[PDB]
Amino acid sequence: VSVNLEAFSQAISAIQALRSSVSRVFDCLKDGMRNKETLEGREKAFIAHFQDNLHSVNRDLNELERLSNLVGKLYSQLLQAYKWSNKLQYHAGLASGLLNQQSLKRSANQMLVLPPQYVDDVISRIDRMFPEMSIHLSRPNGTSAMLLVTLGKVLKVIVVMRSLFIDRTIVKGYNENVYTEDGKLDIWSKSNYQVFQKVTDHATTALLHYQLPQMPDVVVRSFMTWLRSYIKLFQAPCQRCGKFLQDGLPPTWRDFRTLEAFHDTCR
């Protein structure tokens, strides 16, 4: 497992540090006291350097002992290709991140139509991960798919798509009846509580925020990733004021790209 890899590389650097620090002790003692103007000042400098070197040796030995407490347990062509594959994969990950952070594309111009089967395959692929979210697709009105995403015992989100691109979302509480009299989805309602109206507003900013132009799978996957973080409503405190309640509201803002809780008044 990877923790053994990290502990072994850690303890490798611990041995190298121990050896170099012992040699540094004996090298600084080889040179002897320097001059340093004031006699009192030169004595102080020599004593301080020797003490620091000894302390560093002790720290390195202690760290090696701590890793010891925590440690657990033609053919060359294949390994060369394996190493070069991992190298290319990591290199490409870094270069792709650096380049798509800073794109120079200004306009798409130079000089939506999808089978519903594809939408069902995509959304079932999202439903297979996140075992606490269940997504139930239905199409009461044409090709525009409507999704009920239940989330723990916490949320019921009604997502109204339009050609495999999220359009509207409505977040209601668990007990709340999301069905009309006839058992269809109540696409147009609100949720009787202050908290879930705030989370509808935050979800509309979430669907306005996660916008790739072309590829919509990253959009729906990232929206569900962000939505999954709301399972710690009523349990997470705000990361600005520490408390749970500002004006009788839990922290309704799970921040994009770092899913942390905030009261929206604490931005």
Binding site: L112, V113, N141, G142, T143, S144, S163
Partner: protein
């Protein structure tokens, strides 16, 4: 009589819903073209 009239109603509503979806896609194209016009 009831079953025949229900089938006619369902045919009319399926036709209308498919019409709405096709018209909506055309409206999306026309909105992009009209709002992004330079003029």
């Amino acid at each position: 009589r009831n079953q025949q009239l229900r089938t006619l109603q369902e045919e009319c509503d399926r036709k209308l819903i498919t019409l709405r979806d096709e018209i909506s896609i055309d409206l999306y194209e026309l909105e992009e073209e009209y709002y992004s016009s330079s003029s």
